[PDB]
Amino acid sequence: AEPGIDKLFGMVDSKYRLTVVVAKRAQQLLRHRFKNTVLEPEERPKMRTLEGLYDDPNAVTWAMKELLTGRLFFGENLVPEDRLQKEMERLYP
Amino acid sequence: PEWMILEAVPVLPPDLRPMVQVDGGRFATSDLNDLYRRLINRNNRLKKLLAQGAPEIIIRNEKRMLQEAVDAVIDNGRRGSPVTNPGSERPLRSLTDILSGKQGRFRQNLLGKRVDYSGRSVIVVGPQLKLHQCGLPKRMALELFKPFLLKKMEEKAFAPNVKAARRMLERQRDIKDEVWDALEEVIHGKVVLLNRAPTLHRLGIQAFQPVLVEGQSIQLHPLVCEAFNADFDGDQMAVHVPLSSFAQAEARIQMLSAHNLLSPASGEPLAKPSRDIILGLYY
Amino acid sequence: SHGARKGGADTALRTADSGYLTRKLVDVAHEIVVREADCGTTNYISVPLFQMDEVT
Amino acid sequence: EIKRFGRIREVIPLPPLTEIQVESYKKALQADVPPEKRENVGIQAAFKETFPIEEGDKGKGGLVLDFLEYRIGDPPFSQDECREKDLTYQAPLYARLQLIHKDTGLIKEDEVFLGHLPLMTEDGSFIINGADRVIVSQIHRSPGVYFTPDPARPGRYIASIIPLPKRGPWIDLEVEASGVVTMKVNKRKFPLVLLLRVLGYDQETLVRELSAYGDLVQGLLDEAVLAMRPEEAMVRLFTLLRPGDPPKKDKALAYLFGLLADPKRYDLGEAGRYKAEEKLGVGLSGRTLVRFEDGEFKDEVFLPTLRYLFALTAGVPGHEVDDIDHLGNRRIRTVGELMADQFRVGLARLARGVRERMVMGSPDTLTPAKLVNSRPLEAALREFFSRSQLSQFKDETNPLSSLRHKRRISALGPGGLTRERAGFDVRDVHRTHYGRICPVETPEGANIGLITSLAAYARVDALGFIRTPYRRVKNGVVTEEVVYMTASEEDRYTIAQANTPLEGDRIATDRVVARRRGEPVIVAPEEVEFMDVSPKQVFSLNTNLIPFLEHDDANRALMGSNMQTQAVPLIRAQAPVVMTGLEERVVRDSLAALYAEEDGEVVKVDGTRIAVRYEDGRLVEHPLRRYARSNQGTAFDQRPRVRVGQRVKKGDLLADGPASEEGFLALGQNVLVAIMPFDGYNFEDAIVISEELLKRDFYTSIHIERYEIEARDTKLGPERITRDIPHLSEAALRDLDEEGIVRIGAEVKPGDILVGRTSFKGEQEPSPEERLLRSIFGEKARDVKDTSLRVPPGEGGIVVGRLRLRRGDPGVELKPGVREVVRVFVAQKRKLQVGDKLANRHGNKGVVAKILPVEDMPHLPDGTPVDVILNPLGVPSRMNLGQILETHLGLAGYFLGQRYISPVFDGATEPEIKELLAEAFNLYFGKRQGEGFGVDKREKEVLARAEKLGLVSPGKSPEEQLKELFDLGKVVLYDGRTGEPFEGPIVVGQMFIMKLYHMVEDKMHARSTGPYSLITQQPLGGKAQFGGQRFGEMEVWALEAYGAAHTLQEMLTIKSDDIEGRNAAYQAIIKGEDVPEPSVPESFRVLVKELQALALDVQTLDEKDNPVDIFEGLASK
Amino acid sequence: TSVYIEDVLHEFSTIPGVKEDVVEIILNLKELVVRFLDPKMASTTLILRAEGPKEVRAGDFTPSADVEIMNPDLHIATLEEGGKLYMEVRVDRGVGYVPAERHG
Amino acid sequence: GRLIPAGTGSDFVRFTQVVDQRTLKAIEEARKEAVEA
Amino acid sequence: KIAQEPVSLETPIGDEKDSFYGDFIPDENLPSPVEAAAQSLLSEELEKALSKLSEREAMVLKLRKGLIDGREHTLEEVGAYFGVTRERIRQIENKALRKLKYHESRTRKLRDFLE
Amino acid sequence: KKEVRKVRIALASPEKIRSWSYGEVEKPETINYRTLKPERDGLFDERIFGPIKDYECACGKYKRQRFEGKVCERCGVEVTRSIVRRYRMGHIELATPAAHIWFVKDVPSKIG
RNA sequence: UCGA
DNA sequence: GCATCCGTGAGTCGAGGGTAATAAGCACAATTTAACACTTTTGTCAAG
DNA sequence: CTTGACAAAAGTGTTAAATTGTGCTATACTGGGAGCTGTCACGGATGC
Ligand SMILES: [Mg+2]
Ligand SMILES: [Zn+2]
């Protein structure tokens, strides 16, 4: 199975809540080209490659470990969507 | 309620009632067209009769034909034998004909439909494969993920841009390592889905990590095969893909095969050991 | 062969009936989805584990 | 060598298997049959029925056309010629008639030309539209009278009557419970004493025969009517049954007349008249109900059906309820019956084309020359051979395919039953079925029992009564009488079995197998009456090709048979080394092979043509068609098996067939087979194979496909097939010979053009970016655009057939507005791939899973590895032991090589094959003994472990123990990976398999973004249509069950037909971004506007009750 | 591996004066074993001529340097009256088993 | 052809919002940029 | 050829009832995703390939080839734009299209779209 | 621009239906057997429903997007995409008023 | 019509 | 209320398959379309 | 980049040839026409 699942499900009450979380965060990772994330070089989800070993481009896996640490924060009505989305596309290109 | 007697009859847009030719050169069209046509014939002929002060009999009869024709262009068959293309027993399909029924625009196009980015093939056993693993045909996957491989070719050198990739693929089967290993770089992470008809239990549709293997066949984990209501007698399974990263999340989280391992019906295990395994283990 | 062939035809037509059933079922309770974590109903129904043996 | 087996010996061979199509059609041919002396039935009935044509009596305009003969002959083109031309194989038919004036009495005789009616080919398959097709036999309850218990009344009995389909109304004698009786026909209820009006009866004759039975008098008596007379009360039910037209008197003598008395509107099969006649215990000639005699109508039919009904209801013996689905009561529509019937009604349409045309005009210039038409008739019969349900694509998948297919019968179609109406008794197998129709073989789908196949010895006469061959006996005497006893007649006598205690041509044991009506009963040497020729007749063709079939359950047997239909050709094909011995006439009567017509001698082999100068002194040759495409793409080939020259007898095979091995059907091969769970790769009816065979090319075949293109002339002007394309590089122009078509023997990848075509696209100003793009390179805008015809993905290989016929060429016609057409064959050698369907005669399926290298493989002490290693799971669940016994006989038989004929139910048994095992082993242990070997330590180990469960009798030396083990069907195998043996013995041997039609190289398909449907933007479907899969309602439901909301949404929108959704998607992934959220599915919008056409106001609101615009700026007017 | 004949379209079309068709003559190809008298010869070529009503066999070929046939008795085609055929084959050496479809 | 009221797109859980630590404290400050006004 | 009328879309084909005609027709009257991105591509790739031309001759080139408003402007009109004779605009087009030709024959980026 | 959370349904009135329509369809004929151009009033008419070609008029005096929505004076076709051909309806004015068999022959039979 |  | 009728349904995906054939006529007015003549525009060329 | 010259592309004006739309024919023609079957279950209106 996908590594670190049981704990993931163990976090959110709704089995589906996790999905919303993963989706939004991962998409945000694709937005900024991975400079947002709380993962350091050792935690970077490197994918095995014959050519050369690089970071896995897939946003989903990234989101997985991202929440796996717990450095993130998830909640409904967290902050107004305005300042929430305006300062996200600012900090990073 | 007076509107039920409605005077002006709404006409469906032409492109919704298509007429176009083919390689053979002949033209085709829907039935609703002819229906509408004959209707207008009756209405107009009536109009030419009314003002000229035609006898009341012919007039009344023509009004009869007006009602029957309209109502025919709606429910055709609700009264008497439906009007058909002359000489052919094939009934002219009206509005209500398409709106309802099996292959009607409801069940056929809104509760299910043909979709892009898909395809299917035969099935082969997976004894090496894990719960999240599926043998994916080479060629299939190539013409499956073509947009993804397009962008991957955009990033990884080899051709300057997007269109160059397309034309560097579709022409000349030259599958040389430039592609075979780039599609790889897009493959990891996101996973796809497999379904075996009939779709009974939700487990009839599961999700697996794509692994490209040489062949035109499809490999799948032997244990969940039972859940798909499928034996190896020559079956055919269909494959698709969850484009949106949101939908992709969904695909790997609750839609993944490795995740729901128990019966949503009985609460008992799903993929539990089957046939051969049990044989050896027991023996 | 009499018996068997009969059996086969049976199972087929019954598959068709199965399709019938299932579709109809998906058209009734479909609008039902777990929403309120606890609705707050005080109601309930008991289900005894004790079943009477007939004629015994 | 060939050794063979069995106890019961066939006293007579199988009559030709091609006649049920050919002969029963030939009866309605009367080809060679003289113009004067003919059969009056079949096609001749189609004439004598629609003739003589007349309008008048002696009066102002009279006319009478009378019938004379319809010249048979002059086939325009031979079979092969028609097939390449797309023209129907047919022939002019020439009717000679006389036009006699009623007044002048001047006979003016003229012969006319009816049209072109398709004629039957050799094997019994017609050629329509250049394609080989076939007419499958039809089946329906034979015309006549019948009696069943009253479906309504508890103890009463009801009767029924009916002629040929649509050619007469139904009749029912039902007693509704008033105590009185009400007959009901075509939805109405009228007293039984009503119809007796014009029947020539009154108060008297009625009570003459009424009370001759029993309590039945009263219900058949009336007062308020009976006082009337035949022409008075004649108008009663005429007023009733048809309120449509005014109830006159003179029209009550007409509308009613055509119902029965008219021979043409009531036409009742010669069999119906027959069976009903000998049924009711009466006699009759006319095929009508009552004759028209001089005013009122006499009586023939009604009186007997009343006598028999009222008898049965009374309970007098001998009058019983005629069985419903009984074979004696059901007939078969064959080719001749069908074609002739359609000729009857179609020629009636032509009769309209006669009687109507001859009075608009002047009798002065008159003759059937101007009075006779074509299209009604010619197009009626043209309609029967194509659009009808009983006519479809020939089964060319193999010779046995067309054979069996032609021998299959369907109750479906025009005037049988339909899918919507079927019960248990409809598709079931009646008690007396027996040696007539195959109790097993039938489609495993929803068609089980719906389409049955004909048995072996069973025949069909012109009466449609099926008659199975039996054997008469008088007190233990085996008579040479071959009794064709009718089904109805079969129910009579006592019939024994072919398996009876046969010895010294007399009855051996007292108690003997036998039956009546299908009821098993033990009998004695006296009451013995009839017997069976051979158990073969109790099944169909393919079902009879299965050895030890008595050990296989009916299900998998059925599967085995229809799978024998699914079989494909094989280059190296090898007939089963164990068969039922039936394959001889299988290749003969299939007409797929070439034999010696008479005694003669070979001159030249020449795989093109084998010339054999016959003993009769004349020089004759029989050329060959090598590697020709069939309907299913299955290759047709004939291999000469005779040397440069030798003398042969009559019937000796000089050439093979698509699958024919030395006069034997060769489906698959007999290759070495092992049985064991090998690395779980054979899991659940899965297969596994060895590369070894791929070297020897055991199962490898050839497949051809049909390619074509039209040159059709555009409204902007004509196109043509040429070698020029404006932007095409020299690279793709390679394989084109000189004229723009692919040459012979050129490989084509599935990107590669076969036939080039050139058109001119409609003139539209290039988009600005395109304008500039055209400007930089200054590329000429060549008004001619590429129309060229490419090849589909997955289909590739060399080229054989190349045929192109333009408009006006000799012996060709084109479509109205087309210029040229090109047709190229593509031939490809297909080696068996991984995942392909394969199966045996014993009904075990599977697909190829991961062929194993020649290196690793469970070999034997001789070092010969196996070729399959099939898992032993599907055997006990699906219950087929025939493959087991077959594999054992193949075990002992591989060493010997001699063949095995095990006819169905009669053949090899445990003791026989046991001796075969002991034999082969003696010589095997001999093989290693003199070659300097002995018992292997690993074999000692396996024998020791087997000795624990008593698998080999203990106390005996390992030599004898291996004798026993090997005898059991299993030997010692060594894993080709480890080299170590296996814990226990593994049954192995020679067994027959097959390479099934379904091939992964074809079925496999995928699409990224293709075209869409015109009506709704939903993607296409199909394979060659280049389209995606559809997501079913239940698929949607399951997807929701997982709770994937987006996956579903994207599925129904972005991923399928969404307006900008799919486009913006392609945009997104192409750019690497994430796909935005869709708006309108666009099938939905179509739905909306449809509802608008229904004046359904479609209002889409929002968060609070407000109009939302679903169509952006679209209809605002 | 390699085979050519001045008379043929493809692997099929039947050569006059020859019993078996082309692909059957190919059934007789892979069953033909030939060793080279040199370790260092990668590829090679062979020439064959059979006219008249004489049969064809591996021994009927044109012998040369560094070539020996291990089965001259191998049947190729039964040539009927006056069958004329020219033939040539490249017999190369390599490892394992590679089908014709995977090598050009 | 819209978002199904249940599942992941449920009207319960689709409201759930996520933030990484850096950007979390990045906006957690700028909310206080309004305390001067 | 004119005789035969339009064939009904509701014509059932095959041996079944469910196999239809009307949904078997491809829709080419509308753009395709591959075509949408192709057109967008030519547009963008040519859009950036625009800046490597003289500031005057690029703008002019947008007229003669019918880019700006979609309607092609004749030599006389573009000449009436920059205050130069139409002949000037003509040779402007020559040198512009050829300068672009250098950049094309070199870069090989837009070498595609050759139909 | 706005979420659609609700789908209503109702009875369309004659005047409403008139407003839906872009014109009356007069001549009950497909197109010309020669030009294949929508007939003057023909059911496939591009003059009211929508242009046969994207962002163009009929006669061709307006070939381009430089004219947007402006009705052609030589033809009378709004210059716009052919897309509107699917979304723009017509109507037929029936001489004598006529009911609809739906609420007539249905089980409840509204009008009855 | 045939696979599953 | 009791028997007896119109009315509505009835399993999944697929593979292919497919192609076709009735009807009066004649003069004449009204336009439509094809033809032709010729003015103007525009793109090219010789050469400032 | 500019002026005059000039070929062809293109614009426009006027007609000939085609295509298409209309009206009428006078011995007397005066109430169609074609058939089809071998369910089954339930719900509703309707005739008992
Ligand atoms: Mg299966
Ligand atoms: Zn216009």
Residue numbers in the entry:
A (entry chain E): 2 to 94
B (entry chain D): 509 to 791
C (entry chain D): 1074 to 1129
D (entry chain C): 2 to 1118
E (entry chain A): 54 to 157
F (entry chain D): 1469 to 1505
G (entry chain F): 324 to 438
H (entry chain D): 2 to 113
Authors' account:
CarD is a global regulator that is an essential protein in Mtb, the causative agent of tuberculosis. Crystal structures of Tth and Mtb CarD reveal an N-terminal domain with a Tudor-like fold (CarD-RID, RNAP interacting domain) in common with the Eco transcription repair coupling factor (TRCF)-RID, and a helical C-terminal domain (CarD-CTD).
Crystals of CarD transcription activation complexes were prepared by soaking Tth CarD into Taq Δ1.1σA-holoenzyme/us-fork (−12 bp) or full RPo crystals. The structures of CarD transcription activation complexes were refined to 4.4 and 4.3 Å-resolution, respectively. The protein/protein and protein/nucleic acid interactions were essentially identical among all of the four crystallographically independent complexes, so the more complete and higher resolution CarD/RPo structure is described here. CarD does not make significant interactions with σA but interacts with the promoter DNA from −14 to −10 from the opposite, (distorted) minor groove side of the DNA such that the σA/DNA interactions and the structure of the transcription bubble in RPo and CarD/RPo are essentially the same. The N-terminal ends of two CarD-CTD α-helices (α3 and α5) make direct contacts with the promoter DNA. The peptide backbone nitrogen of CarD-L124, at the N-terminal end of α5, closely approaches the backbone phosphate oxygen of the template strand (t-strand) at the −14 position [−14(t)], possibly forming a hydrogen bond, an interaction likely facilitated by the partial positive charge of the α5 helix dipole. The bulky, hydrophobic planar side chain of W86, located at the N-terminal end of α3, wedges into the splayed minor groove at the upstream edge of the transcription bubble. Despite the relatively low resolution of our analysis, CarD-W86 was clearly resolved in electron density maps. The minor groove W-wedge increases the lifetime of RPo by preventing transcription bubble collapse.
